Amino acid sequence: DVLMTQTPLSLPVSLGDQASISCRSSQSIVHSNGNTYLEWYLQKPGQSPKLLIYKVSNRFSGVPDRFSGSGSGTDFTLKISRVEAEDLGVYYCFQGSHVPWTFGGGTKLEIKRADAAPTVSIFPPSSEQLTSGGASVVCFLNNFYPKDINVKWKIDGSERQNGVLNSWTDQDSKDSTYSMSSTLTLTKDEYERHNSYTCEATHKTSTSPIVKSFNRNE
Amino acid sequence: VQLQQSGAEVMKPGASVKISCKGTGYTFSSYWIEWVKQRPGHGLERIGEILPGSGSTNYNEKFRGKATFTADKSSKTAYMQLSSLTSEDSAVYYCARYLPYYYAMDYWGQGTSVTVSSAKTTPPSVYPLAPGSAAQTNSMVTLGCLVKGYFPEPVTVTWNSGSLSSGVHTFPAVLQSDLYTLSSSVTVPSSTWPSETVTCNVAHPASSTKVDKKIVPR
Numbered sequence: 218d219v220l221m222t223q224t225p226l227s228l229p230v231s232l233g234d235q236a237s238i239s240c241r242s243s244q245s246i247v248h249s250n251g252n253t254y255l256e257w258y259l260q261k262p263g264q265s266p267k268l269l270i271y272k273v274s275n276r277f278s279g280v281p282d283r284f285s286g287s288g289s290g291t292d293f294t295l296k297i298s299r300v301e302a303e304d305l306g307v308y309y310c311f312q313g314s315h316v317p318w319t320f321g322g323g324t325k326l327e328i329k330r331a332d333a334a335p336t337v338s339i340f341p342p343s344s345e346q347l348t349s350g351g352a353s354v355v356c357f358l359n360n361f362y363p364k365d366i367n368v369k370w371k372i373d374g375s376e377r378q379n380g381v382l383n384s385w386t387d388q389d390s391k392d393s394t395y396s397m398s399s400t401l402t403l404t405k406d407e408y409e410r411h412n413s414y415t416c417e418a419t420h421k422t423s424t425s426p427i428v429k430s431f432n433r434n435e
Numbered sequence: 436v437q438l439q440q441s442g443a444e445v446m447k448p449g450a451s452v453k454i455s456c457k458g459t460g461y462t463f464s465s466y467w468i469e470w471v472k473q474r475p476g477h478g479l480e481r482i483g484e485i486l487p488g489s490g491s492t493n494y495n496e497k498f499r500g501k502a503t504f505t506a507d508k509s510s511k512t513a514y515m516q517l518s519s520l521t522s523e524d525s526a527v528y529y530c531a532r533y534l535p536y537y538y539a540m541d542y543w544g545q546g547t548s549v550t551v552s553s554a555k556t557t558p559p560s561v562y563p564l565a566p567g568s569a570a571q572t573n574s575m576v577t578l579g580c581l582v583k584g585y586f587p588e589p590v591t592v593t594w595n596s597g598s599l600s601s602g603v604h605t606f607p608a609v610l611q612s613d614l615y616t617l618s619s620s621v622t623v624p625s626s627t628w629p630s631e632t633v634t635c636n637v638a639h640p641a642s643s644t645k646v647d648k649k650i651v652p653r
């Protein structure tokens with residue numbers, strides 16, 4: 218099974234900036250017919266993959282000319298001259314030369330822009346959560362970029378990491394900024410015991426961790 | 436040309452499912468049908484292929500024995516049967532039309548979603564959330580409306596008749612324990628929040644539930 222590797226796993230590039238994806242093969246995928254069967258597929262979020270290039274260079278009918286591929290042996294690359302918004306997505310390699318035919322790892326293509334500071338927040342549990350016999354503590358980290366974000370809970374100075382819910386939102390379109398909704402759940406007996414609950418956030422824009430705490434004893 | 440796939444399916448662990456891909460507008464018997472698995476996390480994996488004309492079939496080593504392909508020439512449909520379903524078999528399955536060494540996977544199906552779990556059709560448990568008592572009020576305040584304890588997907592969380600189309604961050608749903616949960620946040624001025632009325636419109640078409648509950652200002 219020919220293994221295909223793609224680098225980089227992420228390629229942040231601004232609009233109008235040339236992008237270049239690289240593909241490597243575990244073994245030469247050349248074929249006796251004089252052609253090597255490599256194809257490139259783009260899968261936008263929530264949609265089926267779309268063919269872009271086949272036989273290394275040939276462009277599928279109905280694709281913008283900005284896309285272009287090339288390579289040989291075990292080295293292939295895909296070049297986008299001028300990137301636009303509809304070009305966002307994941308690009309997949311595909312070798313159709315040696316049975317079985319395998320897919321590439323995938324290279325998530327994103328757009329880069331000026332770093333935006335995180336917008337952190339914290340909300341305590343609700344009353345119905347108390348009635349049901351549990352606790353739900355939530356921390357929101359909204360509109361932060363790039364992905365260099367880390368979240369850590371220091372309950373009364375003690376770091377809590379067990380049972381940490383982690384939720385990140387894909388890159389937006391209106392602002393193209395990431396967001397996180399990491400949370401945790403506690404029990405009433407365990408929710409009324411510890412005095413101080415904390416939710417920190419580590420980001421590049423501010424080397425010093427951003428502190429967001431709320432005291433159970435209040 | 437068009438490939439039509441069956442609808443979404445939900446099965447219990449240890450059961451078996453039979454997805455169908457119907458192809459119309461071309462010589463169905465002469466084109467291989469590629470089956471592709473895409474886990475929600477990431478990656479495209481090729482399960483195998485079948486040529487409806489003959490009985491030939493191929494399987495990727497990872498899926499050998501898990502999946503069995505059958506084709507019906509009378510009705511232009513191709514089937515895949517998954518045996519001994521487990522949690523890792525929950526994914527989106529695509530069917531594509533392929534001709535090796537020639538025309539590539541130019542046409543794809545809409546994609547069938549299969550979820551493996553022992554849960555039932557639990558309705559939502561929306562818990563509206565308000566800013567904490569110990570929290571400063573700034574010019575731009577973000578709202579929050581939590582939803583948890585629901586199954587299966589999807590649940591369309593939105594605002595009153597698109598009350599706030601912009602500034603909305605609907606985070607992806609996640610499995611806390613056995614049920615799905617999500618959250619949302621919309622940015623609004625503090626001046627208009629007391630006056631303007633906005634309600635997180637949680638929906639659950641699977642359970643035929645349409646419940647609207649706004650977050651009363653604290």
Ligand SMILES: *[C@@H]1O[C@H](CO)[C@@H](O[C@@H]2O[C@H](CO)[C@@H](O[C@@H]3O[C@H](CO)[C@@H](O)[C@H](O)[C@@H]3O)[C@H](O)[C@H]2NC(C)=O)[C@H](O)[C@H]1NC(C)=O
Nearest residue numbers: 248249250251252253254272274275314534535536537538
């Ligand atoms: C089976 O054998 C036939 C005949 O030997 C092969 O057909 C030939 O395939 C080559 C390679 O694709 C064709 O050359 C290419 O033609 C295209 C279109 O004209 C051109 O754009 C390329 O630059 C290149 O010149 C060739 O025309 C074609 N000849 C005929 C008569 O069909 C076929 O590829 C072989 N198939 C396999 C799987 O080995």
